[PDB]
Amino acid sequence: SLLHLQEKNWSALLTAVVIILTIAGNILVIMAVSLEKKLQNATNYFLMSLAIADMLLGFLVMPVSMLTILYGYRWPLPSKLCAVWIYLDVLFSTAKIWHLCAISLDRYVAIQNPSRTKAFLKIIAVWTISVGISMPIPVFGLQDDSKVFKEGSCLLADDNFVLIGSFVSFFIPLTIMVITYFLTIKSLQKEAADLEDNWETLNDNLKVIEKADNAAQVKDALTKMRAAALDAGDILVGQIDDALKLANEGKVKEAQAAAEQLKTTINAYIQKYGQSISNEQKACKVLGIVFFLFVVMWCPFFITNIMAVICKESCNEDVIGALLNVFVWIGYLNSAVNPLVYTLFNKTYRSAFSRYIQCQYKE
Ligand SMILES: CC(C)CCC[C@@H](C)[C@H]1CC[C@H]2[C@@H]3CC=C4C[C@@H](O)CC[C@]4(C)[C@H]3CC[C@]12C
Ligand SMILES: CCCCCCCC/C=C\CCCCCCCC(=O)OC[C@H](O)CO
Ligand SMILES: CN(C)CCc1c[nH]c2cccc(O)c12
Ligand SMILES: [Mg+2]
Protein backbone atom coordinates (compact mmCIF):
# COMPACT_ATOMS: atom_id res chain seq x y z
CA SER A 1 0.00 0.00 0.00
CA LEU A 2 1.76 3.24 -1.28
CA LEU A 3 0.57 6.92 -1.93
CA HIS A 4 0.95 8.04 1.75
CA LEU A 5 0.81 11.74 2.95
CA GLN A 6 3.86 12.21 5.31
CA GLU A 7 5.68 14.77 7.51
CA LYS A 8 7.96 16.03 4.60
CA ASN A 9 6.64 19.53 5.50
CA TRP A 10 9.94 21.42 6.21
CA SER A 11 10.37 21.30 2.38
CA ALA A 12 6.64 21.65 1.51
CA LEU A 13 6.26 25.16 3.03
CA LEU A 14 9.29 26.68 1.13
CA THR A 15 7.72 25.39 -2.11
CA ALA A 16 4.58 27.55 -1.59
CA VAL A 17 6.85 30.66 -1.48
CA VAL A 18 8.44 29.82 -4.88
CA ILE A 19 4.96 29.20 -6.42
CA ILE A 20 3.52 32.61 -5.33
CA LEU A 21 6.70 34.50 -6.23
CA THR A 22 6.46 32.91 -9.71
CA ILE A 23 2.75 33.50 -10.33
CA ALA A 24 2.59 37.10 -9.01
CA GLY A 25 6.03 37.99 -10.44
CA ASN A 26 5.23 36.88 -13.93
CA ILE A 27 1.65 38.27 -13.89
CA LEU A 28 3.21 41.74 -13.28
CA VAL A 29 5.52 41.23 -16.32
CA ILE A 30 2.52 40.22 -18.50
CA MET A 31 0.50 43.22 -17.07
CA ALA A 32 3.48 45.63 -17.65
CA VAL A 33 4.00 44.76 -21.35
CA SER A 34 0.25 44.84 -22.18
CA LEU A 35 -0.37 48.20 -20.44
CA GLU A 36 2.98 50.08 -20.97
CA LYS A 37 3.65 51.82 -24.31
CA LYS A 38 7.38 52.08 -23.37
CA LEU A 39 7.53 48.24 -23.27
CA GLN A 40 5.99 47.69 -26.70
CA ASN A 41 9.22 46.33 -28.30
CA ALA A 42 10.07 42.85 -29.69
CA THR A 43 12.47 41.87 -26.88
CA ASN A 44 9.76 42.83 -24.37
CA TYR A 45 7.27 40.80 -26.42
CA PHE A 46 9.44 37.69 -25.91
CA LEU A 47 9.91 38.55 -22.20
CA MET A 48 6.04 38.40 -21.80
CA SER A 49 5.84 34.97 -23.50
CA LEU A 50 8.63 33.76 -21.25
CA ALA A 51 6.63 35.10 -18.24
CA ILE A 52 3.48 33.32 -19.59
CA ALA A 53 5.68 30.13 -19.81
CA ASP A 54 6.84 30.84 -16.19
CA MET A 55 3.25 31.44 -14.96
CA LEU A 56 1.95 28.27 -16.59
CA LEU A 57 4.85 26.50 -14.86
CA GLY A 58 3.67 28.04 -11.58
CA PHE A 59 -0.08 27.25 -12.02
CA LEU A 60 0.28 23.73 -13.48
CA VAL A 61 3.76 22.08 -13.13
CA MET A 62 5.05 23.47 -9.81
CA PRO A 63 1.96 22.59 -7.61
CA VAL A 64 2.04 18.93 -8.71
CA SER A 65 5.81 18.93 -7.99
CA MET A 66 4.95 19.99 -4.42
CA LEU A 67 2.12 17.41 -4.27
CA THR A 68 4.58 14.49 -4.83
CA ILE A 69 6.88 15.90 -2.07
CA LEU A 70 3.77 15.62 0.18
CA TYR A 71 3.47 11.89 -0.74
CA GLY A 72 7.19 10.93 -0.35
CA TYR A 73 7.50 10.89 -4.19
CA ARG A 74 4.80 8.18 -4.58
CA TRP A 75 2.68 9.74 -7.36
CA PRO A 76 -0.75 10.64 -5.80
CA LEU A 77 -2.81 11.37 -8.96
CA PRO A 78 -4.09 9.07 -11.71
CA SER A 79 -1.18 7.28 -13.50
CA LYS A 80 -2.02 8.71 -16.94
CA LEU A 81 -1.48 12.27 -15.61
CA CYS A 82 2.23 11.58 -14.94
CA ALA A 83 3.35 11.88 -18.58
CA VAL A 84 1.02 14.87 -18.97
CA TRP A 85 2.81 16.56 -16.02
CA ILE A 86 6.30 15.57 -17.33
CA TYR A 87 5.23 16.95 -20.76
CA LEU A 88 4.18 20.40 -19.45
CA ASP A 89 7.27 20.67 -17.23
CA VAL A 90 9.64 19.98 -20.17
CA LEU A 91 7.36 22.02 -22.52
CA PHE A 92 7.67 25.23 -20.48
CA SER A 93 11.42 24.82 -19.82
CA THR A 94 12.03 24.10 -23.52
CA ALA A 95 9.88 27.15 -24.44
CA LYS A 96 12.00 29.25 -22.01
CA ILE A 97 15.41 28.13 -23.48
CA TRP A 98 14.31 28.53 -27.15
CA HIS A 99 12.92 31.96 -26.21
CA LEU A 100 16.21 33.08 -24.73
CA CYS A 101 17.85 31.82 -27.93
CA ALA A 102 15.23 33.72 -30.00
CA ILE A 103 15.94 37.02 -28.15
CA SER A 104 19.77 36.74 -28.43
CA LEU A 105 19.48 35.79 -32.12
CA ASP A 106 16.77 38.36 -33.09
CA ARG A 107 18.73 41.27 -31.58
CA TYR A 108 22.00 40.28 -33.32
CA VAL A 109 20.09 40.29 -36.60
CA ALA A 110 18.40 43.59 -35.51
CA ILE A 111 21.98 44.94 -34.87
CA GLN A 112 22.64 44.10 -38.62
CA ASN A 113 19.31 45.94 -39.69
CA PRO A 114 18.47 49.67 -40.37
CA SER A 115 5.82 45.02 -35.83
CA ARG A 116 3.75 43.20 -33.21
CA THR A 117 2.89 40.65 -35.98
CA LYS A 118 6.59 40.02 -36.95
CA ALA A 119 7.28 39.46 -33.19
CA PHE A 120 4.09 37.29 -32.63
CA LEU A 121 5.03 35.00 -35.58
CA LYS A 122 8.39 34.31 -33.96
CA ILE A 123 6.93 33.50 -30.56
CA ILE A 124 4.37 31.06 -32.03
CA ALA A 125 7.25 29.53 -34.03
CA VAL A 126 9.34 28.92 -30.88
CA TRP A 127 6.30 27.48 -29.02
CA THR A 128 5.54 25.30 -32.06
CA ILE A 129 9.17 24.03 -32.06
CA SER A 130 8.98 23.50 -28.26
CA VAL A 131 5.65 21.55 -28.42
CA GLY A 132 7.12 19.54 -31.34
CA ILE A 133 10.34 18.66 -29.48
CA SER A 134 8.54 17.82 -26.22
CA MET A 135 5.99 15.59 -28.06
CA PRO A 136 7.64 12.08 -27.56
CA ILE A 137 6.96 12.27 -23.82
CA PRO A 138 3.14 11.81 -24.04
CA VAL A 139 3.32 9.91 -27.36
CA PHE A 140 5.65 7.19 -25.94
CA GLY A 141 5.22 7.64 -22.15
CA LEU A 142 1.41 7.34 -22.14
CA GLN A 143 1.97 4.09 -24.08
CA ASP A 144 4.66 2.78 -21.64
CA ASP A 145 4.67 3.80 -17.94
CA SER A 146 8.27 2.41 -17.82
CA LYS A 147 9.41 5.73 -19.39
CA VAL A 148 7.57 7.99 -16.86
CA PHE A 149 7.50 5.92 -13.59
CA LYS A 150 10.44 4.66 -11.53
CA GLU A 151 9.01 2.62 -8.59
CA GLY A 152 5.81 4.70 -8.32
CA SER A 153 7.90 7.90 -8.64
CA CYS A 154 6.70 9.92 -11.64
CA LEU A 155 9.94 11.10 -13.36
CA LEU A 156 11.32 10.69 -16.90
CA ALA A 157 13.08 7.31 -16.62
CA ASP A 158 13.71 6.91 -20.41
CA ASP A 159 17.52 7.47 -20.64
CA ASN A 160 17.32 8.21 -24.37
CA PHE A 161 14.62 10.86 -23.80
CA VAL A 162 16.85 12.38 -21.08
CA LEU A 163 20.05 12.31 -23.26
CA ILE A 164 18.76 13.20 -26.77
CA GLY A 165 16.26 15.67 -25.27
CA SER A 166 19.13 17.37 -23.36
CA PHE A 167 21.30 17.88 -26.49
CA VAL A 168 18.50 18.57 -29.00
CA SER A 169 16.14 20.72 -26.92
CA PHE A 170 18.86 22.38 -24.74
CA PHE A 171 22.44 22.31 -26.05
CA ILE A 172 21.44 23.29 -29.66
CA PRO A 173 19.91 26.61 -28.53
CA LEU A 174 22.43 27.11 -25.66
CA THR A 175 25.25 27.06 -28.23
CA ILE A 176 23.32 29.46 -30.48
CA MET A 177 22.43 31.76 -27.55
CA VAL A 178 26.04 32.10 -26.23
CA ILE A 179 27.47 32.66 -29.82
CA THR A 180 24.86 35.28 -30.89
CA TYR A 181 25.24 36.98 -27.49
CA PHE A 182 29.08 37.14 -27.74
CA LEU A 183 29.03 38.51 -31.33
CA THR A 184 26.26 41.03 -30.32
CA ILE A 185 28.55 42.38 -27.63
CA LYS A 186 31.44 42.42 -30.21
CA SER A 187 29.04 44.16 -32.72
CA LEU A 188 28.17 46.90 -30.14
CA GLN A 189 31.82 47.26 -29.03
CA LYS A 190 33.04 47.88 -32.62
CA GLU A 191 30.18 50.39 -33.21
CA ALA A 192 30.99 52.48 -30.12
CA ALA A 193 34.64 52.26 -31.39
CA ASP A 194 33.75 53.40 -34.93
CA LEU A 195 31.66 56.32 -33.45
CA GLU A 196 34.64 57.82 -31.59
CA ASP A 197 36.66 57.22 -34.86
CA ASN A 198 34.15 59.60 -36.50
CA TRP A 199 33.92 61.92 -33.44
CA GLU A 200 37.73 62.47 -33.66
CA THR A 201 37.92 62.85 -37.49
CA LEU A 202 35.03 65.38 -37.63
CA ASN A 203 36.49 67.25 -34.58
CA ASP A 204 39.93 67.00 -36.37
CA ASN A 205 38.57 68.68 -39.57
CA LEU A 206 36.79 71.44 -37.59
CA LYS A 207 40.26 72.34 -36.29
CA VAL A 208 41.57 72.20 -39.95
CA ILE A 209 38.81 74.34 -41.51
CA GLU A 210 39.00 77.20 -38.96
CA LYS A 211 42.86 77.37 -39.36
CA ALA A 212 42.76 77.28 -43.18
CA ASP A 213 43.83 80.24 -45.45
CA ASN A 214 43.01 78.76 -48.83
CA ALA A 215 40.06 77.04 -50.51
CA ALA A 216 42.37 73.90 -50.69
CA GLN A 217 42.50 73.10 -46.98
CA VAL A 218 38.78 73.88 -46.48
CA LYS A 219 37.80 71.69 -49.47
CA ASP A 220 40.00 68.69 -48.54
CA ALA A 221 38.72 68.81 -44.97
CA LEU A 222 35.03 69.16 -45.93
CA THR A 223 35.40 66.31 -48.46
CA LYS A 224 36.90 64.10 -45.71
CA MET A 225 34.05 65.10 -43.32
CA ARG A 226 31.34 64.11 -45.88
CA ALA A 227 33.19 60.76 -46.33
CA ALA A 228 33.09 60.11 -42.56
CA ALA A 229 29.51 61.56 -42.47
CA LEU A 230 28.44 58.75 -44.91
CA ASP A 231 30.45 56.33 -42.68
CA ALA A 232 27.95 56.84 -39.71
CA GLY A 233 24.53 56.24 -41.58
CA ASP A 234 21.26 61.85 -43.79
CA ILE A 235 20.46 65.18 -41.98
CA LEU A 236 24.02 66.70 -41.93
CA VAL A 237 25.49 65.31 -45.22
CA GLY A 238 23.47 67.84 -47.32
CA GLN A 239 24.58 70.60 -44.90
CA ILE A 240 28.24 69.66 -45.71
CA ASP A 241 27.14 69.51 -49.38
CA ASP A 242 25.67 73.00 -48.66
CA ALA A 243 29.14 74.13 -47.44
CA LEU A 244 31.08 72.04 -50.10
CA LYS A 245 29.96 74.31 -53.06
CA LEU A 246 31.01 77.42 -50.95
CA ALA A 247 34.61 76.02 -50.98
CA ASN A 248 34.30 75.19 -54.73
CA GLU A 249 33.52 78.79 -55.83
CA GLY A 250 36.36 79.95 -53.48
CA LYS A 251 34.00 81.55 -50.82
CA VAL A 252 36.42 80.60 -48.01
CA LYS A 253 35.59 82.74 -44.88
CA GLU A 254 31.92 82.07 -45.85
CA ALA A 255 32.47 78.23 -45.92
CA GLN A 256 34.45 78.35 -42.57
CA ALA A 257 31.46 79.89 -40.72
CA ALA A 258 29.10 77.34 -42.39
CA ALA A 259 31.25 74.53 -40.85
CA GLU A 260 30.73 76.12 -37.38
CA GLN A 261 26.95 75.61 -38.09
CA LEU A 262 27.76 71.87 -38.78
CA LYS A 263 29.34 71.77 -35.28
CA THR A 264 25.93 71.91 -33.43
CA THR A 265 24.38 69.29 -35.81
CA ILE A 266 27.37 66.94 -35.07
CA ASN A 267 27.18 67.10 -31.25
CA ALA A 268 23.36 66.74 -31.69
CA TYR A 269 23.75 63.55 -33.84
CA ILE A 270 26.70 62.15 -31.70
CA GLN A 271 25.34 62.34 -28.11
CA LYS A 272 21.89 61.16 -29.43
CA TYR A 273 23.24 58.19 -31.54
CA GLY A 274 25.82 57.58 -28.69
CA GLN A 275 23.12 57.42 -25.99
CA SER A 276 21.64 54.95 -28.54
CA ILE A 277 24.35 52.24 -28.37
CA SER A 278 24.81 53.13 -24.63
CA ASN A 279 21.22 51.88 -24.20
CA GLU A 280 21.41 48.70 -26.33
CA GLN A 281 24.59 47.73 -24.40
CA LYS A 282 22.73 48.31 -21.07
CA ALA A 283 19.84 46.08 -22.25
CA CYS A 284 22.01 43.40 -23.87
CA LYS A 285 23.66 42.96 -20.44
CA VAL A 286 20.25 42.70 -18.63
CA LEU A 287 19.27 40.02 -21.14
CA GLY A 288 22.71 38.47 -20.45
CA ILE A 289 21.80 38.12 -16.72
CA VAL A 290 18.38 36.56 -17.68
CA PHE A 291 20.44 34.26 -19.98
CA PHE A 292 23.18 33.51 -17.38
CA LEU A 293 20.87 32.89 -14.40
CA PHE A 294 18.75 30.53 -16.58
CA VAL A 295 21.86 28.47 -17.28
CA VAL A 296 23.55 28.56 -13.86
CA MET A 297 20.45 27.74 -11.75
CA TRP A 298 19.54 24.77 -14.02
CA CYS A 299 23.22 23.56 -14.39
CA PRO A 300 23.21 21.47 -11.14
CA PHE A 301 19.93 19.68 -12.20
CA PHE A 302 21.18 19.31 -15.76
CA ILE A 303 24.67 17.75 -15.04
CA THR A 304 23.26 15.41 -12.31
CA ASN A 305 20.34 14.16 -14.55
CA ILE A 306 23.16 13.17 -17.05
CA MET A 307 25.38 11.57 -14.35
CA ALA A 308 22.22 9.51 -13.52
CA VAL A 309 22.61 8.07 -17.05
CA ILE A 310 26.47 8.05 -17.47
CA CYS A 311 27.35 6.42 -14.10
CA LYS A 312 24.14 4.32 -14.00
CA GLU A 313 25.98 1.46 -12.24
CA SER A 314 28.85 3.34 -10.54
CA CYS A 315 26.85 6.03 -8.59
CA ASN A 316 24.25 5.73 -5.75
CA GLU A 317 20.95 6.13 -7.67
CA ASP A 318 19.14 6.88 -4.31
CA VAL A 319 21.27 10.00 -3.60
CA ILE A 320 21.25 10.98 -7.34
CA GLY A 321 17.41 10.67 -7.15
CA ALA A 322 17.65 12.53 -3.82
CA LEU A 323 19.64 15.41 -5.41
CA LEU A 324 17.42 15.99 -8.47
CA ASN A 325 14.40 16.57 -6.21
CA VAL A 326 16.43 19.56 -4.85
CA PHE A 327 18.09 20.61 -8.09
CA VAL A 328 14.74 20.96 -9.99
CA TRP A 329 13.58 23.53 -7.33
CA ILE A 330 16.76 25.54 -7.96
CA GLY A 331 15.71 25.75 -11.60
CA TYR A 332 12.06 26.34 -10.67
CA LEU A 333 13.09 29.38 -8.55
CA ASN A 334 14.48 30.74 -11.84
CA SER A 335 10.82 31.34 -12.82
CA ALA A 336 10.60 33.89 -9.94
CA VAL A 337 13.94 35.65 -10.78
CA ASN A 338 13.22 37.06 -14.32
CA PRO A 339 10.71 39.55 -12.76
CA LEU A 340 13.14 40.68 -10.02
CA VAL A 341 15.84 41.44 -12.65
CA TYR A 342 13.39 43.65 -14.49
CA THR A 343 12.51 45.41 -11.13
CA LEU A 344 16.20 46.07 -10.34
CA PHE A 345 17.62 46.75 -13.82
CA ASN A 346 14.66 48.54 -15.70
CA LYS A 347 12.95 51.81 -14.43
CA THR A 348 10.01 51.09 -16.79
CA TYR A 349 8.95 47.71 -15.39
CA ARG A 350 9.75 48.98 -11.90
CA SER A 351 7.36 52.02 -12.11
CA ALA A 352 4.76 49.75 -13.68
CA PHE A 353 4.93 47.11 -10.86
CA SER A 354 4.92 50.05 -8.36
CA ARG A 355 1.57 51.34 -9.76
CA TYR A 356 -0.11 47.90 -10.12
CA ILE A 357 0.37 47.10 -6.40
CA GLN A 358 -1.30 50.51 -5.60
CA CYS A 359 -4.06 49.50 -8.15
CA GLN A 360 -3.46 52.38 -10.60
CA TYR A 361 -3.55 51.37 -14.30
CA LYS A 362 -3.36 54.67 -16.49
CA GLU A 363 0.34 55.42 -17.41
C1 LIG B 1 -2.23 24.43 -21.39
C2 LIG B 1 -3.12 25.67 -21.22
C3 LIG B 1 -3.50 25.88 -19.73
C4 LIG B 1 -2.44 26.91 -21.82
C5 LIG B 1 -3.03 28.21 -21.40
C6 LIG B 1 -2.50 29.37 -22.16
C7 LIG B 1 -2.93 30.76 -21.63
C8 LIG B 1 -2.38 31.02 -20.23
C9 LIG B 1 -2.48 31.82 -22.64
C10 LIG B 1 -2.82 31.36 -24.08
C11 LIG B 1 -3.21 32.62 -24.86
C12 LIG B 1 -2.69 33.74 -23.99
C13 LIG B 1 -3.09 35.16 -24.34
C14 LIG B 1 -2.76 35.40 -25.80
C15 LIG B 1 -2.53 36.84 -26.14
C16 LIG B 1 -2.52 37.82 -25.26
C17 LIG B 1 -2.42 39.25 -25.77
C18 LIG B 1 -1.25 39.97 -25.14
O19 LIG B 1 -1.17 41.34 -25.54
C20 LIG B 1 -1.40 39.89 -23.65
C21 LIG B 1 -1.43 38.44 -23.15
C22 LIG B 1 -2.57 37.60 -23.76
C23 LIG B 1 -3.94 38.07 -23.24
C24 LIG B 1 -2.30 36.11 -23.42
C25 LIG B 1 -2.52 35.73 -21.95
C26 LIG B 1 -2.24 34.25 -21.64
C27 LIG B 1 -3.01 33.29 -22.55
C28 LIG B 1 -4.52 33.35 -22.25
C1 LIG C 1 0.88 29.48 -25.06
C2 LIG C 1 0.70 28.13 -24.29
C3 LIG C 1 0.66 26.86 -25.12
C4 LIG C 1 0.41 25.59 -24.33
C5 LIG C 1 0.37 24.34 -25.17
C6 LIG C 1 -0.08 23.08 -24.46
C7 LIG C 1 -0.10 21.82 -25.32
C8 LIG C 1 -0.72 20.62 -24.65
C9 LIG C 1 -0.85 19.49 -25.60
C10 LIG C 1 -0.33 18.27 -25.51
C11 LIG C 1 -0.48 17.29 -24.39
C12 LIG C 1 -1.02 15.94 -24.85
C13 LIG C 1 -1.77 15.17 -23.78
C14 LIG C 1 -2.96 14.37 -24.24
C15 LIG C 1 -4.07 14.24 -23.20
C16 LIG C 1 -3.81 13.22 -22.12
C17 LIG C 1 -4.87 13.16 -21.07
C18 LIG C 1 -4.67 12.02 -20.09
O19 LIG C 1 -3.74 11.24 -20.13
O20 LIG C 1 -5.63 11.95 -19.16
C21 LIG C 1 -5.35 11.11 -18.02
C22 LIG C 1 -6.61 10.78 -17.24
O23 LIG C 1 -7.09 11.96 -16.60
C24 LIG C 1 -6.39 9.69 -16.19
O25 LIG C 1 -7.58 9.36 -15.47
C1 LIG D 1 12.88 19.46 -16.32
N2 LIG D 1 12.48 18.04 -16.26
C3 LIG D 1 13.45 17.17 -16.96
C4 LIG D 1 12.32 17.57 -14.88
C5 LIG D 1 11.69 16.18 -14.78
C6 LIG D 1 11.18 15.87 -13.41
C7 LIG D 1 10.01 16.29 -12.86
N8 LIG D 1 9.92 15.83 -11.58
C9 LIG D 1 11.04 15.10 -11.27
C10 LIG D 1 11.41 14.43 -10.10
C11 LIG D 1 12.60 13.77 -10.09
C12 LIG D 1 13.47 13.76 -11.19
C13 LIG D 1 13.11 14.41 -12.35
O14 LIG D 1 13.97 14.37 -13.41
C15 LIG D 1 11.87 15.10 -12.41
MG1 LIG E 1 42.88 63.25 -34.18
How many whole angstroms from 47 Cα to the centroid of ligand 2?
25
* CB of 34 closer than 6 angstroms to any ligand 1 atom: yes
Method: X-ray
> What is the stated resolution of the deposited model, in angstroms?
3.2
Pocket of ligand 3 (CB under 6 A): 86, 89-90, 93, 155-156, 305, 324-325, 328
How many whole angstroms from 226 Cα to the centroid of ligand 2?
63
Angle subtended at Cα 56 by Cα 22 and Cα 326, rounded to the nearest 5 degrees = 55
Fold adopted by 193-272: Four Helix Bundle (Hemerythrin (Met), subunit A) (1.20.120)
b/e 154-184 (16+ beta carbons within 10 angstroms → b): bbbbbeebbeebeeebbeebbebbbebbeeb
Ligand nearest to the CA of 228: 4
- Ligand 4 is an ion; residues with CB less than 5 A from it: 200, 204
Indicate which residue's Cα is closest to atom 18 of ligand 1: 34
Closest CA to 175 of 341, 281, 295, 46: 295
Q: What is the SS3 string spanning the chain?
A: CCCCCCCCHHHHHHHHHHHHHHHHHHHHHHHHHHHCHHHCCHHHHHHHHHHHHHHHHHHHHHHHHHHHHCCCCCCCCCHHHHHHHHHHHHHHHHHHHHHHHHHHHHHHHHHCCCCHHHHHHHHHHHHHHHHHHHCHHHHHHCCCHHHCEECCEECCCCHHHHHHHHHHHHHHHHHHHHHHHHHHHHHHHHHHHHHHHHHHHHHHHHHHHHHCCCHHHHHHHHHHHHHHHHCCCCCCHHHHHHHHHHHHHCCHHHHHHHHHHHHHHHHHHHHHHHHHHHHHHHHHHHHHHHHHHHHHHHHHHHHHHHHHHHCCCCCCHHHHHHHHHHHHHHHHHHHHHHHHHHHHHCHHHHHHHHHHHCCCCCC
